[PDB]
Write a protein that binds this ligand. Structure first.
Ligand SMILES: O/N=C\c1cccs1
Length: 163
């Protein structure tokens, strides 16, 4: 297991524009196109991202290319975020994957409400952090995925994904 395999499980792979769990136009492996309810705006974003007229459909290679870009940008974002970087750097490699996963799903804006969880993670108070992480809109809206990510934070193992 690694971050790509982990997010591939959590996000799936769809080659046609679809709406994510929040109702937002998305494609590939959780590549958010726009929060606009306008499908045409989503198609424009898609074409811009891929560099051709896609008419709402991409290939697996194209999906994987966006995925690589998205994972990389997520990590690089964490590293330039003064609140997230010290916590991220305090973690072992497996828990770092949980951090990347959460940011990938919620964005840095989404992680802004997790100050108390972050503190517990940096303190390596794993059970306490796990309890705190679940007290969230995130948990309640996507519980099965959040449970997997939280188990990863709690244990620093891949137990929730090796299935
Ligand atoms: O927990 N979700 C995101 C992050 C944690 C620590 C650095 S990023």
């Amino acid at each position: 297991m690694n971050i790509f395999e982990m997010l591939r499980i959590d996000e799936g792979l769809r080659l046609k524009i679809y709406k994510d769990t929040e109702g937002y136009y998305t494609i590939g492996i959780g590549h958010l196109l726009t929060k606009s309810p306008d499908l045409n705006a989503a198609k424009s974003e898609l074409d811009k991202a891929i560099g051709r007229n896609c008419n709402g459909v991409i290939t697996k290679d194209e999906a994987e290319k966006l995925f690589n870009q998205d994972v990389d940008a997520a990590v690089r974002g964490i590293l330039r975020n003064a609140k997230l970087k010290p916590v991220y750097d305090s973690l072992d490699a497996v828990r770092r994957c949980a951090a990347i996963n959460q940011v990938f799903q919620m964005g840095e804006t989404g992680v802004a409400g997790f100050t108390n969880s972050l503190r517990m993670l940096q303190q390596k108070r794993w059970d306490e952090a796990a309890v705190n992480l679940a007290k969230s809109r995130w948990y309640n809206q996507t519980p099965d995925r959040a449970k997997r990510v939280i188990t990863t934070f709690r244990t620093g193992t891949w137990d929730a994904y090796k299935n």
